[PDB]
């Protein structure tokens, strides 16, 4: 019957069969048949009288349900479906970003109460904030690692931290280490990753980006180190209003880290690190 | 046929830096989202 209606282009006869054989699930058969033949355009262009049966059929097919929900003006459902699809998307960064942007537009086009709309926009904005750390990865680092933002997976917070602080990021500045520190908030309590160890690693790698040699022993160690990436990270944390006394590892814990083994022999580094720690802790008190 | 850049207009209009969404009427914002959907349909055809 479907093959005859498709070979004869007889849409009025097909609609008559959807009514006549409604009790025998003919609509579900027709929808499966269009899906299997790849005729998705005809599946989504069904008359408004069939939108209830098409909605029920598409519940097993999330990747297509949002298109029907949008066509049916069910923007609140389209938002939820697109948000679930964005949450499940780990394989393509640009696809997750597109799904969140579409989910946000669907929420903004819906009749959500202002309080609920603001909650859903904030939930998406928080995920968009996380994805901005992946989008703002240095283009040269992406080229050197052979990564394409259009084809790469969604990276976990730890993998993004590693890319920001890695030795191959030769142009890492205070903002790259600040983004690596900001990314610590996205590491959940259930992760095998020690957030305090990773915070220590980020700060040790920031310290390693600067030369801690005494340029002509007459400069105030605090003034001489002012342009260092590590000191700019401390200044940025203080400007964000973060309590340095609770947030930073003890100056002794940094000096004990195995990562800093090349700098442990430098008495000027030890003095300058302690002097900066005491200075910025006193600037906050 | 720059359909990907059509969709980036949503990010520009919704940006907190320029607050362009405040100058649109509710009707124009609906029409913009409908136009963006026309561009997304052409991306699905690709």
Residues of B whose CB is below 8 A from A101 = 7, 10-11
Residue at token pair 């537009």: A105
Instruction: Identify whether the C-beta of residue A270 lies closer than 8 Å to the C-beta of residue A207.
Output: no
- Provide the experimental method for this PDB entry: cryo-EM
Distance, in Å, from the CA atom of A179 to the CA atom of A131, rounded to the nearest integer, reads 12
Residue at token pair 């996380």: A130
Distance, in Å, from the CA atom of A230 to the CA atom of A208, rounded to the nearest integer, reads 9
Long-range contacts of A16-22 (CB under 8 A, 24+ apart): A18/A50
Chain centroid to Cα A25, Å, comes to 42
Asked if A104's CB is within 8 angstroms of B14's CB, the reply is yes
End-to-end CA distance of chain B: 11
The resolution in Å comes to 6.9
Q: How many angstroms separate the CA of residue B30 from the nearest CA in chain A?
A: 7
* Chain breaks of chain B after residues with C–N above 2.5 Å: none
Distance, in Å, from the CA atom of A251 to the CA atom of A245, rounded to the nearest integer, reads 11
3-state secondary structure of A4: helix
Distance, in Å, from the CA atom of A53 to the CA atom of A45, rounded to the nearest integer, reads 13
Asked if B29's CB is within 8 angstroms of A105's CB, the reply is no
Instruction: Identify whether the C-beta of residue A93 lies closer than 8 Å to the C-beta of residue A152.
Output: yes
How many other C-beta atoms can be found within 10 angstroms of the C-beta atom of residue A159?
Answer: 13
Instruction: Identify whether the C-beta of residue A203 lies closer than 8 Å to the C-beta of residue A248.
Output: yes
Distance, in Å, from the CA atom of A255 to the CA atom of A276, rounded to the nearest integer, reads 13
Asked if B11's CB is within 8 angstroms of A101's CB, the reply is yes
Instruction: Identify whether the C-beta of residue A185 lies closer than 8 Å to the C-beta of residue A127.
Output: no
The CA–CA distances, whole Å, from A155 to A113, A164, A285 equal 34, 12, 38
DSSP E strand stretches across A95-161: none
Q: What is the CA radius of gyration of chain B?
A: 11
How many other C-beta atoms can be found within 10 angstroms of the C-beta atom of residue B11?
Answer: 12
């Amino acid at each position: 019957l479907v093959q005859i209606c498709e070979m004869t282009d007889n849409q009025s006869r097909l609609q008559r069969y959807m009514t006549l054989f409604a009790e025998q699930n003919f609509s579900d058969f027709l929808f499966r048949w269009y899906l299997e033949k790849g005729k998705r355009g005809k599946l989504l262009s069904q008359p408004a009288s069939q939108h209830g049966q098409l909605a029920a059929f598409l519940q097993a097919h999330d990747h297509l349900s949002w298109l029907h929900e949008l066509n049916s003006q069910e923007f609140e459902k389209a938002h939820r479906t697109l948000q679930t699809l964005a949450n499940m998307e780990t394989r393509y960064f640009c696809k997750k970003k597109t799904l969140l942007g579409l989910s946000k537009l669907a929420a903004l086009a819906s009749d959500f109460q202002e309080d609920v709309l603001q909650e859903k926009v904030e939930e998406i904005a928080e995920q968009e904030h996380f994805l901005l750390h992946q989008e703002t990865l240095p283009k040269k680092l992406l080229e050197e690692k052979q990564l394409d933002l259009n084809a790469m997976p969604v990276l976990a917070p730890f993998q993004l931290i590693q890319l920001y602080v890695c030795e191959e990021n030769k142009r890492a500045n205070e903002n790259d280490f600040m983004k690596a520190l900001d990314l610590l908030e996205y590491i959940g309590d259930d992760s095998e990753v020690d957030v305090e160890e990773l915070k220590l690693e980020i700060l040790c790698k920031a310290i390693k980006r600067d030369e801690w040699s005494a340029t002509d022993g007459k400069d105030d160690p605090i003034e001489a180190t002012k342009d260092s990436i590590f000191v700019k990270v401390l200044q940025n944390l203080l400007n964000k209003g973060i309590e340095l006394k609770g947030y930073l590892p003890k100056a002794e814990t940094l000096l004990q880290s195995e990562e800093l083994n090349s700098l442990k022999t430098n008495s000027y580094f030890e003095f300058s690190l302690k002097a900066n720690y005491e200075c910025y802790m006193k600037m906050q008190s | 046929k720059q359909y990907k850049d059509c969709l980036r207009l949503a990010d520009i209009v919704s940006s907190e830096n320029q607050k362009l969404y405040t100058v649109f009427s509710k009707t124009e914002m609906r029409n913009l989202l409908q136009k963006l959907r026309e561009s997304s349909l052409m991306l699905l055809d690709l």
